[PDB]
Amino acid sequence: FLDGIEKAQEEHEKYHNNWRAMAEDFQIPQVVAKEIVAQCPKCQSPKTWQMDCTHLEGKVIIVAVHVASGYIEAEVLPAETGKETAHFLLKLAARWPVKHLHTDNGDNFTSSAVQAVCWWAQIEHTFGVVESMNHQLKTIITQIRDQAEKIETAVQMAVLIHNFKRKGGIGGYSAGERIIDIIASDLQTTKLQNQISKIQNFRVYFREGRDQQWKGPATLIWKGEGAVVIQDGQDLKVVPRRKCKIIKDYGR
Amino acid sequence: GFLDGIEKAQEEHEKYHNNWRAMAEDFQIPQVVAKEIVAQCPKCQVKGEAMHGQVDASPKTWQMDCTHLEGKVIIVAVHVASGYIEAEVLPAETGKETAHFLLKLAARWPVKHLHTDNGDNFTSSAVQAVCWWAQIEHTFGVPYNPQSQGVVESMNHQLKTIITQIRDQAEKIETAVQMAVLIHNFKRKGGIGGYSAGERIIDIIASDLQTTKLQNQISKIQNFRVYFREGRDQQWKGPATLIWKGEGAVVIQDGQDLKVVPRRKCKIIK
Amino acid sequence: IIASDLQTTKLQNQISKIQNFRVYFREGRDQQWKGPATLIWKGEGAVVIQDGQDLKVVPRRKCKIIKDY
Amino acid sequence: GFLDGIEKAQEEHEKYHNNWRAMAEDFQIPQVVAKEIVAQCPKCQVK
Amino acid sequence: YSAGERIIDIIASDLQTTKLQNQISKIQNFRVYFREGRDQQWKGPATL
DNA sequence: AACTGGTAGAGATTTTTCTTAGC
DNA sequence: GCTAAGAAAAATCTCTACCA
DNA sequence: AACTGGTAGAGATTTTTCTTAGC
DNA sequence: GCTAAGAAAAATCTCTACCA
Ligand SMILES: C[C@@H]1CCO[C@H]2Cn3cc(C(=O)NCc4ccc(F)cc4F)c(=O)c(O)c3C(=O)N12
Numbered sequence: 001f002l003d004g005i006e007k008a009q010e011e012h013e014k015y016h017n018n019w020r021a022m023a024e025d026f027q028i029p030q031v032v033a034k035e036i037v038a039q040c041p042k043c044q045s046p047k048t049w050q051m052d053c054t055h056l057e058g059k060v061i062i063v064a065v066h067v068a069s070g071y072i073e074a075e076v077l078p079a080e081t082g083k084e085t086a087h088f089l090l091k092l093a094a095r096w097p098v099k100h101l102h103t104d105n106g107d108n109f110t111s112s113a114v115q116a117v118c119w120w121a122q123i124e125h126t127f128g129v130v131e132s133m134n135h136q137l138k139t140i141i142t143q144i145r146d147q148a149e150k151i152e153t154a155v156q157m158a159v160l161i162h163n164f165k166r167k168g169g170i171g172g173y174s175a176g177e178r179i180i181d182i183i184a185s186d187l188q189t190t191k192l193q194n195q196i197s198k199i200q201n202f203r204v205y206f207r208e209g210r211d212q213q214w215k216g217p218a219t220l221i222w223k224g225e226g227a228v229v230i231q232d233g234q235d236l237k238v239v240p241r242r243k244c245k246i247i248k249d250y251g252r
Numbered sequence: 253g254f255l256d257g258i259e260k261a262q263e264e265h266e267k268y269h270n271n272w273r274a275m276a277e278d279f280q281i282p283q284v285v286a287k288e289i290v291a292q293c294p295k296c297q298v299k300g301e302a303m304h305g306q307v308d309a310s311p312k313t314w315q316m317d318c319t320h321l322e323g324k325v326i327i328v329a330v331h332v333a334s335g336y337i338e339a340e341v342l343p344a345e346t347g348k349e350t351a352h353f354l355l356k357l358a359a360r361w362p363v364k365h366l367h368t369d370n371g372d373n374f375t376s377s378a379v380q381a382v383c384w385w386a387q388i389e390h391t392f393g394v395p396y397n398p399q400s401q402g403v404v405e406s407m408n409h410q411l412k413t414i415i416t417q418i419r420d421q422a423e424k425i426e427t428a429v430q431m432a433v434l435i436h437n438f439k440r441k442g443g444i445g446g447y448s449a450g451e452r453i454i455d456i457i458a459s460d461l462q463t464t465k466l467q468n469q470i471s472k473i474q475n476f477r478v479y480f481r482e483g484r485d486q487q488w489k490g491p492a493t494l495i496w497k498g499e500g501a502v503v504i505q506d507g508q509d510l511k512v513v514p515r516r517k518c519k520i521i522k
Numbered sequence: 523i524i525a526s527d528l529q530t531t532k533l534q535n536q537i538s539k540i541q542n543f544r545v546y547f548r549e550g551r552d553q554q555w556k557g558p559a560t561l562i563w564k565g566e567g568a569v570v571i572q573d574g575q576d577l578k579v580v581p582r583r584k585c586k587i588i589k590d591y
Numbered sequence: 592g593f594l595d596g597i598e599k600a601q602e603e604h605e606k607y608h609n610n611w612r613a614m615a616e617d618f619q620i621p622q623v624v625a626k627e628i629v630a631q632c633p634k635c636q637v638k
Numbered sequence: 639y640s641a642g643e644r645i646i647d648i649i650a651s652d653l654q655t656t657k658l659q660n661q662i663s664k665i666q667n668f669r670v671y672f673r674e675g676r677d678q679q680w681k682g683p684a685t686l
Numbered sequence: 687a688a689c690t691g692g693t694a695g696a697g698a699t700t701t702t703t704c705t706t707a708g709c
Numbered sequence: 710g711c712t713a714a715g716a717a718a719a720a721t722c723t724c725t726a727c728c729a
Numbered sequence: 730a731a732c733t734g735g736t737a738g739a740g741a742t743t744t745t746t747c748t749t750a751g752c
Numbered sequence: 753g754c755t756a757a758g759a760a761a762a763a764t765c766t767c768t769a770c771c772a
Pocket residue numbers: 317318369370371372396398399405771772
């Protein structure tokens with residue numbers, strides 16, 4: 001265990017690994033490897049979307065693309081005013097976690113209805129991939145046009161073919177597997193951060209071997225069944241539980 | 253004896269329709285004969301059997317229903333294993349808008365099984381053509397039995413309570429419907445893992461994909477064939493793949509069926 | 523000739539005592555109780571009954587299955 | 592049901608004087624009514 | 639076989655062995671909520 | 687400050703009773 | 710003569726629909 | 730022959746945690 | 753210094769209305 005912590009610290013000193021790889025290799029828990037990463041001085045987006053509009057056969061299409069995976073949601077608007085763009089933004093924010101929106105300096109994107117929707121849904125709007133996605137979507141639309149009667153059915157069938165039937169990239173996945181994996185990784189990071197702060201609200205007085213004095217207040221990191229990992233003086237050490245006293249610390 | 257009691261009890265039930273305890277007490281016949289006298293009557297036998305079933309909860313099953321609110325028509329679709337809600341306001345209750353809503357939902361999320369009631373819009377050629385083109389298995393419930401689609405009617409109740417909570421913050425009803433969908437999906441926690449509905453659908457689909465890839469990489473390099481002895485008769489069956497060897501029992505795969513065999517009735521051959 | 527008739531009657535008695543059931547079900551909009559039918563398939567939750575050369579699916583909560591002694 | 596079985600078992604014991612286990616296996620009536628059919632005959636004794 | 643096919647085959651076999659021994663515990667680190675017969679509550683987190 | 691859900695039947699499971707083989 | 714296995718029969722417990 | 734009730738909140742009761750008096 | 757009483761706070765179990 002302590003040999004695992006020493007090997008992990010030497011391995012991060014050489015190669016600067018990440019905490020998932022160290023937790024899998026050296027068989028240490030995740031909070032300890034995250035603290036090893038958090039102590040390195042040389043080591044210190046999944047919710048950004050881009051929106052645009054286009055024209056196709058006299059219809060006004062609006063396209064929203066998740067940037068980090070290439071995930072497309074499209075719709076056919078009856079006009080190009082601000083209320084319909086605000087309604088499309090409200091549906092998009094109600095289905096996926098949207099935290100940062102990037103648009104161009106158009107008329108309908110600079111409107112009081114879109115600003116009210118961004119205020120109620122807590123989205124940061126920023127004015128300046130989407131043109132390449134519009135080009136690829138129009139190629140698919142002209143490829144499967146003869147199987148539909150209206151234009152909305154062709155738009156939604158092209159969205160389905162782009163999202164789940166086209167595979168590429170490094171691992172050979174589509175866009176839906178990429179966006180689900182990215183958001184799941186971010187969720188794991190936030191849950192681990194909550195556990196880290198809740199554990200680190202404590203304090204430990206420990207007694208060394210062949211001594212009867214209590215030592216300085218070291219910060220608790222991991223409280224096991226028989227072992228306790230503490231940080232003191234930029235050093236991690238493992239003390240057994242029968243030589244330690246854990247108190248609360250109100251030191252904000 | 254009680255044979256004349258049996259004849260008099262049959263005539264008494266023919267006139268008065270007693271239950272079995274009255275005949276067994278008044279005519280001193282045993283209870284099996286009185287239960288048979290009651291059980292061979294057609295004017296009786298009006299009662300169920302007092303049990304409930306359990307609906308399908310596969311990771312790609314969706315359920316759909318329609319509801320009314322303030323003179324509008326809402327259409328609700330729910331992902332069953334997580335509780336994830338998509339809802340829209342329709343201008344009419346025909347089959348074309350239902351096929352369009354189903355096509356948008358199938359273009360966003362992976363759908364492989366759809367469950368509905370027997371309404372006039374769900375049983376239509378447009379919905380059948382969309383299900384054929386998108387390869388969806390469409391199943392219908394037993395008619396006039398709303399308990400088969402329990403999840404979507406429960407979510408109808410939850411959606412209506414949220415809409416009454418946030419009604420004064422919106423002008424139209426479509427804005428209030430979309431705000432209620434956002435409040436349900438991301439602002440309410442509690443359930444299986446303490447998650448909301450969006451975190452739970454992300455966790456379910458990502459875990460399914462990761463466990464399929466992991467067991468493909470495991471099972472492509474396996475060995476250790478196992479011959480087992482089971483059944484009512486002590487026979488011997490063909491070659492099966494060993495999966496997991498544990499203290500007490502072994503897990504085998506035979507004919508794409510998983511079985512758990514005790515360690516005494518199996519033999520491992522490399 | 524006689525012994526094979528004994529074996530045939532024993533096997534026919536076992537096959538006849540396998541699945542001689544009657545079902546009183548409740549279906550429709552006005553949920554009234556209807557006459558006897560023949561049970562075909564019995565799964566956990568619903569049953570399939572043959573009535574008047576019509577196949578119907580009734581849940582087990584809306585039907586009563588009478589066996590034989 | 593087995594009520595017609597009880598009637599036919601009474602006729603069969605009136606003719607041939609069977610025992611109770613034979614009538615219970617042949618006519619598919621329970622054992623209590625078969626023992627009562629044997630008991631109400633003055634010449635037979637259930638054993 | 640040439641030399642390149644032999645070195646690729648040898649390294650792939652050894653890596654398959656070691657990563658199999660790790661991936662068994664990786665697939666046993668999941669949690670399952672299941673349902674039994676005639677009870678309407680979801681049972682606790684058994685191991686897959 | 688002084689009011690309120692209940693009844694009966696269908697199966698499943700546990701207990702009691704009755705006949706008979708074996709030492 | 711006495712005892713235990715085994716099966717039939719009676720007793721108890723849990724759960725559902727309907728009452729404007 | 731291949732179908733099926735469920736979701737979320739209010740209290741009551743049991744378990745865990747945190748501070749302090751007493752030997 | 754160590755231990756037990758006591759009270760606050762978090763976790764679990766049972767039960768109800770509503771969904772055309
Ligand atoms: C014309 C379509 C097809 C034929 O049936 C009708 C009537 N119906 C009735 C209810 C209903 O009574 N819901 C309340 C409810 C009551 C008890 C329960 F357990 C669950 C519940 F939801 C529906 O929900 C519903 O969707 C329909 C419906 O769609 N139709």
